Enzyme design. Structure first.
Site, PDB file in Angstrom:
ATOM      1  N   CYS A   8       0.414  -1.296  -0.011  1.00 31.18           N
ATOM      2  CA  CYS A   8       0.118   0.204   0.270  1.00 31.18           C
ATOM      3  C   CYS A   8       0.907   1.412  -0.357  1.00 31.18           C
ATOM      4  O   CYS A   8       2.242   1.479  -0.260  1.00 31.18           O
ATOM      5  CB  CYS A   8      -1.331  -0.105   1.421  1.00 31.18           C
ATOM      6  N   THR A   9       0.287   2.462   0.280  1.00 34.01           N
ATOM      7  CA  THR A   9       1.783   3.462   0.468  1.00 34.01           C
ATOM      8  C   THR A   9       1.978   4.326   1.662  1.00 34.01           C
ATOM      9  O   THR A   9       3.617   3.483   1.324  1.00 34.01           O
ATOM     10  CB  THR A   9       0.802   4.991   0.344  1.00 34.01           C
ATOM     11  N   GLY A  10       1.597   3.381   2.891  1.00 30.14           N
ATOM     12  CA  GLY A  10       1.966   3.990   4.177  1.00 30.14           C
ATOM     13  C   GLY A  10       3.141   2.890   4.764  1.00 30.14           C
ATOM     14  O   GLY A  10       3.634   3.175   5.339  1.00 30.14           O
ATOM     15  N   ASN A  11       2.464   1.375   4.524  1.00 25.71           N
ATOM     16  CA  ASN A  11       2.425  -0.071   4.742  1.00 25.71           C
ATOM     17  C   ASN A  11       2.577   0.113   6.532  1.00 25.71           C
ATOM     18  O   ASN A  11       3.130  -0.009   7.231  1.00 25.71           O
ATOM     19  CB  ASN A  11       4.314   0.092   4.119  1.00 25.71           C
ATOM     20  N   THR A  12       1.737   0.703   7.004  1.00 26.07           N
ATOM     21  CA  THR A  12       1.244   0.761   8.812  1.00 26.07           C
ATOM     22  C   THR A  12      -0.195  -0.021   8.876  1.00 26.07           C
ATOM     23  O   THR A  12      -0.371  -0.240  10.129  1.00 26.07           O
ATOM     24  CB  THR A  12       1.261   2.327   9.171  1.00 26.07           C
ATOM     25  N   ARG A  14      -3.006  -1.525   6.186  1.00 25.76           N
ATOM     26  CA  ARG A  14      -3.304  -2.996   4.658  1.00 25.76           C
ATOM     27  C   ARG A  14      -2.985  -3.903   4.560  1.00 25.76           C
ATOM     28  O   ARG A  14      -3.021  -4.786   4.888  1.00 25.76           O
ATOM     29  CB  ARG A  14      -5.040  -1.718   3.689  1.00 25.76           C
ATOM     30  N   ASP A 119     -10.741   1.069   3.165  1.00 23.61           N
ATOM     31  CA  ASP A 119      -9.909   1.808   3.791  1.00 23.61           C
ATOM     32  C   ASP A 119     -10.004   2.262   5.085  1.00 23.61           C
ATOM     33  O   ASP A 119     -11.041   3.355   5.108  1.00 23.61           O
ATOM     34  CB  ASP A 119      -9.451   3.183   3.198  1.00 23.61           C
TER      35      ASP A 119
END
Length: 148
Positions: A8-12, A14, A119
């Protein structure tokens, strides 16, 4: 040993939830996989978000995670790169076009239909539980499919 990486974007939220859920599912299904996650815009200092951790803790799964940037090395070693959203897939394919043939959204790969994983951003623990449950449904089906 099939190498799977959720992105994903932040990897925190999902993608680390997907990683931890899928590790558990794959082990119970007897599927031999190496499972990781990364973020296209991740900080290296990050942890999974408290609600992501709690959502999995409820189900007796530990989410002990450090965020990781998506790198060429990870893309080279992967067999599958499963994006949470179609924009994540676009971004990955833009940065790592040579490896486009490894990259799919989780929903299209498993279900055949275009879609983005729910999300949980800004949501209560209950929204995170909804994301967890959606991921679990997709990942149970993924395990059955990869074992073919």
């Amino acid at each position: 040993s099939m190498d799977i990486i959720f992105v994903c974007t932040g990897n925190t939220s999902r993608s680390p939830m997907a990683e931890a859920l899928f590790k558990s599912i794959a082990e119970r299904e007897g599927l031999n996989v190496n499972v990781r996650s990364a973020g296209v815009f991740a900080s290296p200092n990050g942890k999974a978000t408290p609600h992501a951790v709690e959502a999995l803790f409820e189900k007796h799964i530990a989410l002990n995670h450090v965020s990781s940037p998506l790198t060429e090395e990870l893309m080279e070693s992967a067999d599958l790169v499963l994006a949470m959203t179609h924009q994540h897939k676009q971004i990955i394919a833009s940065q790592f076009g040579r490896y486009r043939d490894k990259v799919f959204t989780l929903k299209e790969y498993v279900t055949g239909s275009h879609g983005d994983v729910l999300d949980p951003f800004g949501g209560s623990i209950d929204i995170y539980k909804q994301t967890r449950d959606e991921l679990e449904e997709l990942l149970r089906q993924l395990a059955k499919q990869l074992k073919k």
